[PDB]
Amino acid sequence: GFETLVVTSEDGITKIMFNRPKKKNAINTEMYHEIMRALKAASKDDSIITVLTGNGDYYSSGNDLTNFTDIPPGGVEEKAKNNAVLLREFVGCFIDFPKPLIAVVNGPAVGISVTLLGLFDAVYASDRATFHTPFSHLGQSPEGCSSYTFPKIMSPAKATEMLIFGKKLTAGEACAQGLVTEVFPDSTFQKEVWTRLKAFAKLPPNALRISKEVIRKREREKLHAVNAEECNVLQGRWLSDECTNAVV
């Protein structure tokens, strides 16, 4: 039983739903932990496929900034390391996920919830979805392996505008630039998507798991290495002059 997610599994599909609609599905410390437990569970269950999606109008507003409790006794420094270790571990869960992993993007997405899409196997989006990684505005560096994946996926010219200059994309833009697999009209979104997924689940289980493994195994060591770099850099930025300023 989870406090920030709703996890179901049926028809060979495990469905992980973000469930803090009141906060636009902001990811707080607890949800970081719960999403890992959930993914650990889905990796071992009898699902063919695993899906992430958001409850309500938002996919996710990304990392919850109420995580500025700042209360740890060891002040910013302890907090920054702890967050960095947590972030590393969290991203690693996506790098290692052995079964097909699919994002059903119901609405706007932000931050870590967008950068992790670079590690998904497919990504289906409503037309009222948008994609935004404004790390620079907050005096921060990129994460979720996006420093590596996004230039390869989008081309460097297009990735820059999004990661460095913090541009916001529409779903059509994100689909054209290779983040998003396909876009559907919002009124028919859920229907068209789940139909498609129900079909995919009827395909030969081990062929799907093994196909992905052949695609992903050789790249995981690189991605882990990117993740580690990204998180050390970020731990610095969190201690920074500019980051502190920028958050306001």
Distance of closest approach, residue 11 Cβ to a copy of itself, in angstroms: 15
Which region among 2-10, 29-37, 60-68, 158-166 touches a copy of itself (by CB under 8 A)?
A: 158-166
Counting contacts by CB under 8 A, is residue 163 touching a copy of itself? yes
Residues 40/22/172/230 CA torsion (nearest 10 deg): -50
Nearer to a copy of itself, 56 or 139 (CB): 139
Counting contacts by CB under 5 A, is residue 239 touching Cl ion? no
Residues written for the chain: 248
Nearer to a copy of itself, 16 or 231 (CB): 231
Distance of closest approach, residue 246 Cβ to a copy of itself, in angstroms: 6
Distance of closest approach, residue 6 Cβ to a copy of itself, in angstroms: 25
Counting contacts by CB under 8 A, is residue 179 touching a copy of itself? yes
Counting contacts by CB under 5 A, is residue 133 touching Cl ion? no
Q: Which of residues 118-137 bind a copy of itself (CB under 8 A)?
A: 118, 120-123, 135-137
> Residue 86's binding partner, choosing from a copy of itself, Cl ion, none, with beta-carbon cut-off 5 to 8 A by kind?
Cl ion
Task: Name which position in 33, 36, 56, 86 contacts Cl ion (CB under 5 A).
Answer: 86
The two structure tokens encoding residue 19: 């469930």
Distances in whole angstroms, Cα of residue 41 to Cα of each of 82, 193, 218: 24, 23, 24
The two structure tokens encoding residue 167: 């541009």
Counting contacts by CB under 5 A, is residue 50 touching Cl ion? no
Which region among 5-13, 25-33, 38-46, 153-161 touches a copy of itself (by CB under 8 A)?
A: 153-161
**Stretch 209-238: interaction string toward a copy of itself, x if CB under 8 A:** -xxxxxx-xx-------x--xx--x--xx-
Q: What span, in angstroms and rounded, lies between the C-alpha atoms of 231 and 4?
A: 24
Counting contacts by CB under 8 A, is residue 160 touching a copy of itself? yes
**Interface residues toward a copy of itself, by CB under 8 A:** 100, 117-118, 120-123, 135-142, 147-148, 151-161, 163-166, 178-182, 200, 203-208, 210-215, 217-218, 226, 229-230, 233, 236-237, 240-243, 245-246
Residues near Cl ion, by CB under 5 A: 83, 86-87
